[PDB]
Amino acid sequence: HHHHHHMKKILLVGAGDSGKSTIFKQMRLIYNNGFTTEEKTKIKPMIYENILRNMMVLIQATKSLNLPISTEENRQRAEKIEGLEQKILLTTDKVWDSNLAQDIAELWKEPAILQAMARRNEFQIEDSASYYFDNLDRIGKDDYMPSEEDVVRARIKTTGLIEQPFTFKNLPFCMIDVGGQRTERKKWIHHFQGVDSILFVCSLSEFDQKCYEDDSTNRMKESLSLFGDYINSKWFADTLVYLLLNKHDLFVSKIKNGSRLADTFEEYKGPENDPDAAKEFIKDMYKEKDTENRLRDVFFVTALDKANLKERLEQITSDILSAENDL
């Protein structure tokens, strides 16, 4: 008769800018489940709105920093972009055209904008902002269709259930990213919602960022607090929990470029411009929150590096399998 064989489901858990959605999208690519023409068509205006919002944030940042724009032409261009961004949630019109793409590319050369961008950790700017700005020659074309990498880098909030099944060492698995309202059980693979493992994803690179524009709370301090609450309160039943410290390579660049961990965490006494000492301190802070040692393991990862993510996920799935027969 109709029947199933147990699939080991791995649930992605994390904040909205943890990069957990990057992990899921990379898994889609690893398992030949890439983005269709319809998907790319639908995501295209969202990429436009991402780019417009990032430039708006930079314009506002020059005002906060008291940095005058170099020319009246770029000042009027900035005012135009401000007006269009402020209209985005209040219209159904297509705001993006070739004129706007050219205006944003010109503003990306403005010294006041670039000074704000050098201080981007202080502002609410997407990680992918410079990527999109630097590729505006391609993205601003009338014939533009988002690339694979464009989609991976676009932070789109999950509002339903998505699953990526796969086979590893001849056994079935799937990775889950789920949000929004309750998704009916019939939509799940095997119409089954049980979770064998949790990947708790935290950003390593957020140590020098604020939670919101109008709040002083540090993102990493908040994530440590939330992780502490989660790992000590959940009944995990039979579920294995892994901590993934993501955006590792971005963290490394921040440390190498002079953003000091000690400016956020005064207890960090390690060397300056030393990413390995700094990331070990962060890993230790997370493990300290895990009072009863409920974590199975802790991994550093850069989800945007598909080869690195593959390697770390293979380590995780191998370890899940090794624990299956634990007595």
Ligand code: NA
């Ligand atoms: Na069977």
Ligand code: NA
């Ligand atoms: Na069934």
